Enzyme design. Structure first.
Site, PDB file in Angstrom:
ATOM      1  N   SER A  95       0.821  -1.198   0.000  1.00 12.67           N
ATOM      2  CA  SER A  95       0.000   0.000   0.000  1.00 12.67           C
ATOM      3  C   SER A  95       0.889   1.297   0.000  1.00 12.67           C
ATOM      4  O   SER A  95       1.817   1.477  -0.830  1.00 12.67           O
ATOM      5  CB  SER A  95      -0.901  -0.073   1.305  1.00 12.67           C
ATOM      6  OG  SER A  95      -1.983   0.818   1.092  1.00 12.67           O
ATOM      7  N   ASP A 136     -11.686 -14.012   6.874  1.00 14.15           N
ATOM      8  CA  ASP A 136     -11.966 -14.443   5.543  1.00 14.15           C
ATOM      9  C   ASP A 136     -11.302 -15.811   5.364  1.00 14.15           C
ATOM     10  O   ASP A 136     -10.090 -15.900   5.138  1.00 14.15           O
ATOM     11  CB  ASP A 136     -11.421 -13.449   4.574  1.00 14.15           C
ATOM     12  CG  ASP A 136     -11.620 -13.890   3.128  1.00 14.15           C
ATOM     13  OD1 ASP A 136     -12.204 -14.989   2.760  1.00 14.15           O
ATOM     14  OD2 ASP A 136     -11.224 -13.052   2.348  1.00 14.15           O
ATOM     15  N   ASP A 184     -10.109  -2.816  -4.195  1.00 15.82           N
ATOM     16  CA  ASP A 184      -9.707  -3.844  -3.213  1.00 15.82           C
ATOM     17  C   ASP A 184     -10.243  -3.563  -1.770  1.00 15.82           C
ATOM     18  O   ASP A 184      -9.748  -4.166  -0.762  1.00 15.82           O
ATOM     19  CB  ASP A 184      -8.181  -3.982  -3.191  1.00 15.82           C
ATOM     20  CG  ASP A 184      -7.483  -2.782  -2.375  1.00 15.82           C
ATOM     21  OD1 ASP A 184      -8.210  -1.875  -1.876  1.00 15.82           O
ATOM     22  OD2 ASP A 184      -6.220  -2.789  -2.281  1.00 15.82           O
ATOM     23  N   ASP A 224      -5.910  -8.672   2.594  1.00 18.68           N
ATOM     24  CA  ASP A 224      -5.571 -10.068   2.314  1.00 18.68           C
ATOM     25  C   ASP A 224      -4.149 -10.116   1.822  1.00 18.68           C
ATOM     26  O   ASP A 224      -3.463 -11.107   2.109  1.00 18.68           O
ATOM     27  CB  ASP A 224      -6.480 -10.704   1.252  1.00 18.68           C
ATOM     28  CG  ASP A 224      -7.881 -10.829   1.714  1.00 18.68           C
ATOM     29  OD1 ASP A 224      -8.104 -11.189   2.897  1.00 18.68           O
ATOM     30  OD2 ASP A 224      -8.779 -10.473   0.889  1.00 18.68           O
ATOM     31  N   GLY A 251     -16.706 -11.154   2.405  1.00 23.27           N
ATOM     32  CA  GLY A 251     -15.260 -11.482   2.293  1.00 23.27           C
ATOM     33  C   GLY A 251     -14.317 -10.258   2.383  1.00 23.27           C
ATOM     34  O   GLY A 251     -13.174 -10.380   2.897  1.00 23.27           O
ATOM     35  N   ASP A 311      -8.719  -8.682  -1.019  1.00 27.95           N
ATOM     36  CA  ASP A 311      -8.893  -7.297  -0.669  1.00 27.95           C
ATOM     37  C   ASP A 311      -7.591  -6.715  -0.180  1.00 27.95           C
ATOM     38  O   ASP A 311      -6.558  -7.431  -0.101  1.00 27.95           O
ATOM     39  CB  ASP A 311     -10.074  -7.200   0.371  1.00 27.95           C
ATOM     40  CG  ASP A 311      -9.700  -7.684   1.780  1.00 27.95           C
ATOM     41  OD1 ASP A 311      -8.459  -7.622   2.205  1.00 27.95           O
ATOM     42  OD2 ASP A 311     -10.717  -8.079   2.454  1.00 27.95           O
ATOM     43  N   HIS A 312      -7.612  -5.427   0.205  1.00 24.74           N
ATOM     44  CA  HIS A 312      -6.346  -4.669   0.550  1.00 24.74           C
ATOM     45  C   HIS A 312      -5.520  -5.326   1.641  1.00 24.74           C
ATOM     46  O   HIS A 312      -4.288  -5.347   1.562  1.00 24.74           O
ATOM     47  CB  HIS A 312      -6.745  -3.262   1.011  1.00 24.74           C
ATOM     48  CG  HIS A 312      -5.632  -2.312   1.066  1.00 24.74           C
ATOM     49  ND1 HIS A 312      -5.145  -1.687  -0.066  1.00 24.74           N
ATOM     50  CD2 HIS A 312      -4.968  -1.748   2.147  1.00 24.74           C
ATOM     51  CE1 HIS A 312      -4.155  -0.864   0.294  1.00 24.74           C
ATOM     52  NE2 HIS A 312      -3.999  -0.915   1.616  1.00 24.74           N
ATOM     53  N   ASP A 328      -6.645 -10.419   7.382  1.00 23.54           N
ATOM     54  CA  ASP A 328      -8.081 -10.613   7.384  1.00 23.54           C
ATOM     55  C   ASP A 328      -8.490 -11.913   8.052  1.00 23.54           C
ATOM     56  O   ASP A 328      -8.790 -12.955   7.357  1.00 23.54           O
ATOM     57  CB  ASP A 328      -8.689 -10.447   5.994  1.00 23.54           C
ATOM     58  CG  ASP A 328     -10.246 -10.516   6.006  1.00 23.54           C
ATOM     59  OD1 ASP A 328     -10.927 -10.917   7.025  1.00 23.54           O
ATOM     60  OD2 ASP A 328     -10.801 -10.145   4.979  1.00 23.54           O
TER      61      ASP A 328
HETATM   62 CA   LIG Z   1     -10.736 -10.578   2.442  1.00 26.62          CA
END
Ligand SMILES: [Ca+2]
Ligand SMILES: CCCCCCCCCCCCCCCC(=O)O
Ligand SMILES: CCCCCCCCCCCC(=O)O
Ligand SMILES: CCCCCCCCCCCC(=O)O
Ligand SMILES: CCCCCCCCCCCC(=O)O
Ligand SMILES: CCCCCCCC(=O)O
Ligand SMILES: CCCCCCCC(=O)O
Ligand SMILES: CCCCCC(=O)O
Ligand SMILES: CCCCCC(=O)O
Ligand SMILES: [Ca+2]
Lengths: 382, 382
Positions: A113, A356, A304, A348, A280, A345-346, A353
């Site tokens: 990021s 998830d 994301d 993961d 998720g 996602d950002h 996370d």
């Molecule tokens: Ca996720």
């Protein structure tokens, strides 16, 4: 005899705290409980490190701190910078991971990021220097940090970015760089400066460290005068479209460096052409995923959770090439854009996370081995 | 005035705190943020209430408290029962939602999870009394609560149960009820009995209230003597297969009451015939889902997170009929079993799964209004 010739430095983003700097109970940034990036790559014979730099500060401040984290020494933000923005010139002092870092002894840099923006800025200063600092030290003598000199080359082998907002994020512009949320963040930073606090959120250069005999009342009163409350020298600004475009407008490609990006999608198209977060998507990113995914501009929607795809893929004004998963990612001087990780996602990307169950440890281990393998092949094709 | 002639009393289960008895930051039991059951049903013209009864105590201590919650007065657990389990005879005193409740003035009873069991025990006491108290009072004189004497009918119009463990749950036998976990729960109860606590977790009848001038060290010694630590007169025991079968064995059908059950499943079959939790199962129940799902007896495997389908459809060996969602649910004296709600986990019944965006407020709203519809049918057909 580590397996990689060049040390790998992983650089966290915007909110993250690592190592000794994390609170009592707080996720492990690099891999969560899914895959302990540092510990497991080390058990495999790789020489890897996690940088620790300011969690809430500008890319500028972070890039300087990243420099000192690698080289060792006392953070020097530059006189000209300190005077223009109204914060201390000098900061923490770092032990140094590679005290012998210099042209010829290289490092690989991977940034999650905002970490990826930080890395690009630090490298811009090593190669091109910082014009304001060279001018000022010439106008006012005294010292200039070797970070600001220019002419430092062959120091970084690679720059790889994971879910990096290279063109910023509407989640900054419409949330968060807003005045009410900047106050929330700065109030947190003030509180974590208190005299019982063992953790550094990265804004102590603006006054947020309470002195051992200062009352919290005098502390509030003193720090309410800092320029932080109105400055753009902070993360929230830099993560905006304007703030990120400013960074793009003053960076350029080093033809000797291997560039590579990864991007996640965790949104899906709804009946009207808007993007909504997948089940998720880590739930703290639900609103920000909706704000992004309802943009007026269609190509700014897929995201994301907190960074739209058009922002992560590459800086919009810099050269890029789409690569397959199987291509050696071994071209120098051009952003090699990895195929999008569907469902990631950002967060993961860094395995935190914990809600998830689709995203498992062994998947995340293959993802990080894959990046080390690409880095091994930068080493071999030099 | 109200659209329902008989008041509806919703009755929370085992871990539940409601109304002014919930911590500063804490989910709303009846409907989460998805559909605010008490408040919306009042807006729509229904007379409804959220009972408040012991969160950790036995179905017995809870049933006594439910009766006083409705009727008003000071909780009397019975001299024989206090002397047998070693806790106070008299507990908290309630204002009373229906101080005039008596034969002829009926109430509808709706129980989530353990609330379903509590409600059957209360009805059992109204109709049949409590024989150990009747015998005690006969032999020793004194006073006896009218809850214990029997012969009070036409007080309950309906009994409806949501994800009630009528037949117990292996999540109790195998975890929570175990020694190590009762100690945890009892330690939380000791803690929240401290003299700064405004919340009552439902075991103060066992001594868990620190006195205004008692030191914490003294409070610890005094309460370490309580029988709570080894007793069966608590929730964890009553939720086991044996503790719920004891309650099945002492209850009977009332031919004037309309009985209805709902049940959810939130597990799916693995390639060996075991059950694993679906994604979207509220995450705190993932482990308990797996324990239930891996039972030796195949028909005990399907579950909602913490209650197996088999335990929730109806008490075993009490009469039942499977009913459709469309037909009137207006039969008396017989458990009417509603079709299993697919994808609903134990807490989706009360809308507190803020992590599961498949379970919408409009749906939770339709579901409670459908219960009220049934209850109106009960009223119309009597
Ligand atoms: Ca996720
Ligand atoms: C209802 C019981 C919940 C426990 C279920 C087993 C879940 C395993 C996950 C372990 C970590 C979560 C609890 C530690 C608390 C914390 O980190 O703040
Ligand atoms: C997560 C807990 C949030 C508590 C909200 C209090 C906000 C007040 C601003 C506090 C500033 C300070 O203490 O320096
Ligand atoms: C999440 C909070 C848990 C902290 C663990 C403390 C456990 C100690 C048992 C406490 C007994 C008591 O305070 O009376
Ligand atoms: C918030 C916790 C409540 C404790 C208040 C009780 C005061 C008595 C002190 C006994 C000594 C000790 O606390 O270690
Ligand atoms: C009481 C502990 C508070 C720590 C705040 C951490 C915020 C961040 O993750 O950047
Ligand atoms: C310090 C806050 C304690 C909260 C107790 C919650 C237990 C329960 O839900 O029954
Ligand atoms: C408050 C927890 C922060 C985790 C690091 C991140 O979200 O990027
Ligand atoms: C702490 C878990 C106890 C499980 C029994 C139940 O809630 O049905
Ligand atoms: Ca659910």
């Amino acid at each position: 005899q580590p397996l990689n010739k060049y040390p790998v430095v992983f650089v966290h983003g915007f909110l993250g705290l690592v190592g000794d700097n994390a609170p009592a109970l707080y996720p492990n940034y690099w891999g969560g409980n899914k895959f302990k990036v540092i510990e497991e790559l080390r058990k495999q014979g790789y020489n890897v490190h996690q940088a620790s730099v300011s969690a809430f500060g500008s890319n500028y401040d972070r890039a300087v701190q990243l420099y000192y984290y690698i080289k060792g020494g006392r953070v020097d933000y530059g006189a000209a910078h300190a005077a223009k923005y109204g914060h201390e010139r000098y900061g923490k002092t770092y032990k140094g991971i590679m005290p012998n870092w210099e042209p010829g002894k290289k490092v690989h840099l991977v940034g999650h990021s905002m970490g990826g923006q930080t890395i690009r800025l630090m490298e811009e200063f090593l190669r091109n220097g910082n014009k304001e600092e060279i001018a000022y030290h010439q106008a006012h003598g005294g010292e200039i940090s070797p970070l600001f000199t220019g002419g430092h080359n062959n120091m970084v082998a690679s720059i790889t970015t994971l879910a990096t907002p290279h063109n910023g994020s509407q989640a900054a512009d419409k949330f968060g760089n807003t005045e009410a949320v900047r106050k929330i963040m700065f109030a947190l930073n003030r509180f974590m400066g208190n005299k019982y606090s063992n953790i550094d959120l990265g804004l102590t250069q603006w006054g947020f460290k309470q002195l051992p005999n200062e009352s919290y009342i005098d502390y509030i009163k003193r720090v309410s005068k800092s320029k932080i409350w109105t400055s753009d020298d902070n993360a929230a600004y830099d993560l905006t479209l304007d703030g990120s475009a400013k960074l793009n407008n003053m960076t350029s490609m080093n033809p000797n460096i291997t560039y590579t990006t990864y991007t996640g999608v965790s949104s899906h198209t709804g009946p009207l052409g808007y993007e909504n977060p997948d089940l998720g998507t880590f739930f703290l990113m639900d609103t920000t995923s909706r704000i992004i995914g309802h943009d007026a501009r269609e190509e700014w929607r897929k995201n994301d959770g907190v960074v739209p795809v058009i922002s992560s893929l590459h800086p919009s004004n810099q050269p890029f090439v789409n690569v397959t998963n199987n291509e050696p990612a071994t071209r120098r001087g051009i952003w090699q854009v990895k195929p999008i990780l569907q469902g990631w996602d950002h967060v993961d990307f860094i395995g935190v996370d914990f809600l998830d169950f689709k995203r498992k440890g062994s998947e995340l281990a293959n993802f990080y081995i894959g990046i080390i393998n690409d880095l091994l092949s930068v080493e071999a094709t030099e």
